[PDB]
Amino acid sequence: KVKKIVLIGASGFVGSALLNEALNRGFEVTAVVRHPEKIKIENEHLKVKKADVSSLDEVCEVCKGADAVISAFNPIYDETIKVYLTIIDGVKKAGVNRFLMVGGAGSLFIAPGLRLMDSGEVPENILPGVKALGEFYLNFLMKEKEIDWVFFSPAADMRPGVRTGRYRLGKDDMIVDIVGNSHISVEDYAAAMIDELEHPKHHQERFTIGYLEHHH
Incomplete structure (x- = not known):
């Protein structure tokens, strides 16, 4: 089972939201951020580290040994696409099979078609x-077969918002509510991500989420 993970x-x-949700569920996490000072979480299952996400060698080094890696990296933009690539390639060179x-x-x-x-x-x-971000998935992720990506x-x-635990999971179509709006809370999105990490249902593909009910 998955126990040790790196959160970029x-x-x-x-x-x-991903950091707290993972620790609360028993995972040993290595959080990588630009400003460690902003994190005041105290937990023995947590390690905080700095890494140059744009450096292949640095991404590879910090991911060694992990059971899986989750990346929440954000955000001219031809430089951006370049960084998204360095991350996944750094993860593959480290030997991890789940990203x-x-x-x-x-x-x-x-x-x-739209x-x-x-x-x-x-x-x-x-x-x-x-x-x-859309171009990275469409032109790069869709051709990747050397790692189990999601x-x-x-x-x-x-x-x-609130961590309701109630929402619809989809594949490639945007999820909308009765009013026609597509929304989700950051907390519920994180809960779903750790669910996929803990009990894998998807492999080498994209999936989505959204509320069905409408707030008043």
Whole structure:
């Protein structure tokens, strides 16, 4: 079973949510962040380390021995795509067989043959980053066979909320509620990610999540 893991980019709303969810469930975690000072969690199953995510040798070194690696790394952008690659290649060179990545909603279908990125529904101010993340999955992950990867596409609108434990799990189509909105809490997204880590249901593929009920 999976016991020891490395969490790359264990900061921000998502990285922090994954960090706490994994420790609370008995995992021994090595969190890699740019600013260790921001983390004040006290637990004997936790190690905090700094690494140059853009350096292949540094990513490879910190992942050695791990049972699995989860990356929550974010975020011109041809440099970004380049970093997404260095991470997965660093993980493969370390010998780990399971890699889980926090994805985006851009590559999800909102209609037959139409992905969210190409629809115009994405806010102008974040389109560049959305496209780069979607392109990495589509043009790189989809051809990878030398590791068991999982790209987890969150709902179009993800923010801090409640850990309800109730939601729909999908594959490639965006999940929307009765009102037509696609959303999920950061806490519920993390709970699902650790569920996939603890009890594998997906292999070399992308899956997604979203609420079915609507808040009032």
